[PDB]
């Protein structure tokens, strides 16, 4: 019944769910499969002429995120759950998994000219799919508020299938085929979204942790420049729990080595072109070489086996430093966390217990950091546990001695002091910000990592507020405080201003506070950023 007629002139049908109108699984690009593989991808030929889109499709090959070259427990667990016939069955995945979904209000029509929100999921950069992330919550808020949104999701490569780096990937300019990934579901948008209902020129993009990260890399793209036919792609972001990925370049130290291991993994060793040799492996081989390097709850943790890393040519250069450097999209941004954002990384080192050991596995992660440094960083992340993440709990959760430190660490880094070194650099445009502490008092974990993709897809609680109805009105008006909240959402101008700056949630509700904790912290890691790439 819903229907749809794209600018090639083909008619699709999409599924009428009641609540809203849905076209899933439409492929925007060519499998890329055999030779493919690795490569940027190839924009979709083809009729979908007569075709219906009525289920996601699957998707992009899966990491065991407890992977690893080593053997242990988890590790054969995870494996014999993600290769059972059921799971196969429930979740399933194939390296012919680049396709988008659009799901809108129920009697859409063409020309109805609606903003657009395009999700970019988050699993580590090494798992995910858009069939995870029900839009009904988004959608069903929009309508009720009198701000009808068109939530579109697009796929993407993950794990070694799409963030391969090294010399070859390099030298072949097949550097972040992922991000490419997301790139071409974006001009794909621009190209069609009309026909379904929606503005292209009213597309704000959003995703959270990996997601959001992504989001921060496509304002970073070809030094800021994020038109395509002389038109932006966005004119707006939402990053839930992430900024700028502190990494090394694509040819550098650890993008090498992953490279090589997973070369040896899948019995190219021996290959004078391992990059040629790797495209022959079948998918089955493949798939086991890499998950027999790191995935992102192995003892590596944050430390990823595969990530955006600039590559000279559509990232110029270090992340932080373009940032510096104003080589970004002029757009309006929202950007948050969860005030726990380690806590469920420091899982993966619960056998570092003392002072020296910490030392040893700080040093192992960050080979660019001197001892000085070392120190500097353990001196502003003390082992006192009343000081670690989950923040504000006391001795209470001290799992070990180093558990809340290292969770503290890892959380600041990797997103939330990463988030106000951007905050206090980026000029591009009017800048918000929100602190969630929505699950204070949640054992061990505390306001984890994630638990925003509950409020704003699941279940309704204080956060929705923001994770739906804020960001609706963004998406809608440019501006949050157009969603009608009782506390006014402050423009963020510094870390330093006068004055509440972050919009802050509890279980009860929101409230506004400022942005100024672990300055410490701040200055250990971001004095010379680069001392912590990976
Ligand atoms: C904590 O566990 C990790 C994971 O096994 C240990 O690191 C590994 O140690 C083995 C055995 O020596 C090496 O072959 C691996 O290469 C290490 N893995 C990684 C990912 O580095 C680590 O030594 C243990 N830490 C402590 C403090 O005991
Ligand atoms: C101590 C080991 C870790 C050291 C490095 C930590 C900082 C590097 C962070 C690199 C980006 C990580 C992105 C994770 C997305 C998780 S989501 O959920 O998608
Ligand atoms: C990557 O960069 C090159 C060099 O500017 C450019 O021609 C190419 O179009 C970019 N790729 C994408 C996906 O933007
Ligand atoms: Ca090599
Ligand atoms: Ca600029």
Redesign the pocket.
């Known amino acids: 019944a819903p229907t749809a007629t794209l600018a090639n002139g083909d008619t699709i049908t999409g599924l009428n769910a009641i609540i809203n109108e849905a076209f899933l699984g439409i492929p925007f690009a060519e499998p890329p499969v055999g030779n493919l593989r690795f490569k940027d991808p190839v924009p979709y030929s083809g009729s979908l002429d007569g075709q219906k889109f009525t289920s996601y499709g699957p998707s992009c090959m899966q990491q065991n995120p407890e992977g690893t070259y080593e053997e242990n427990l988890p590790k054969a667990a995870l494996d014999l759950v993600m290769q059972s016939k059921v799971f196969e069955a429930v979740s399933p995945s194939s390296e012919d998994c680049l396709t988008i979904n659009v799901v809108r209000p129920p009697g859409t029509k063409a020309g109805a000219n609606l903003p657009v929100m395009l999700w970019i999921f ?4 090494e798992v995910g799919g858009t069939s995870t992330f029900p839009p009904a919550q988004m959608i069903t808020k929009s309508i009720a508020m009198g701000k009808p949104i068109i939530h579109v999701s697009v796929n993407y490569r993950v794990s070694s299938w799409g963030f391969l780096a090294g010399d070859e990937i390099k030298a072949e300019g097949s550097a972040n085929a992922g991000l490419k990934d997301q790139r071409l579901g974006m001009q794909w948008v621009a190209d069609n979204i009309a026909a379904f209902g929606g503005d292209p020129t009213k597309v704000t993009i959003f995703g ?4 959001s ?1 992504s989001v921060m890399c496509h304002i970073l793209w070809n030094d800021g420049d994020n038109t395509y036919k002389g038109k932006p792609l966005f004119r707006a972001g939402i990053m839930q ?2 900024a700028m ?3 090394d370049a694509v040819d550098g130290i650890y993008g090498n080595e992953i490279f090589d291991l997973l070369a040896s993994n899948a019995g190219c060793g021996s290959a004078s072109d391992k990059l040629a040799c790797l495209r022959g492996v079948s998918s089955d081989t493949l798939e086991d070489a890499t998950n027999n390097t790191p995935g ?1 709850l192995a003892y ?5 086996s595969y ?1 955006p890393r600039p590559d000279g040519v559509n990232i110029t250069d270090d992340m932080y430093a373009l940032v510096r450097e104003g080589k970004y999209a002029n757009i309006p941004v929202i950007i948050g966390d969860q005030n726990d954002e380690g806590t469920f ?1 420091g899982t993966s ?1 619960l056998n570092v217990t003392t002072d020296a050991q910490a030392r040893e ?2 040093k192992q ?2 080979v660019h950091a001197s001892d000085a440094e070392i120190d500097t960083l353990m001196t502003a992340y003390p082992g006192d546990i009343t000081q670690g993440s989950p923040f504000d709990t006391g001795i209470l959760n001290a799992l070990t001695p180093q558990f809340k430190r ?1 969770s503290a ?2 959380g600041d ?2 997103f939330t002091l990463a988030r106000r070194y951007f905050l206090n650099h980026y000029t591009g445009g009017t800048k918000y910000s929100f602190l969630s502490k929505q699950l204070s008092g949640l054992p061990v974990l505390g306001t984890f ?2 638990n925003d993709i509950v409020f704003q897809d699941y279940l309704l609680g204080s956060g929705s507020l923001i994770y739906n109805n804020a960001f609706i009105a963004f998406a809608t008006d440019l501006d949050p405080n157009t969603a009608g909240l009782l506390v006014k959402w402050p423009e963020y101008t510094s870390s330093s201003q006068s004055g509440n700056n972050l919009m802050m949630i509890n279980a009860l509700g929101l409230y506004t506070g400022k942005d100024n904790f672990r300055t410490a912290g701040y200055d250990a890691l971001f004095s010379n950023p680069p001392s ?1 790439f ?1």
Not at 122 to 125: E, N, P
Not at 208 to 211: I, K, Q, T, V
Not at 300 to 304: E, G, H, K, M, P
């Open positions: 988050g699993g580590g950069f959270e942790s990996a997601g990260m729990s992430g990925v502190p990494s992102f590596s943790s944050l430390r990823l990530l990384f080192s596995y700080f992660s960050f290292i660490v890892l880094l990797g990592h994630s912590f990976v």
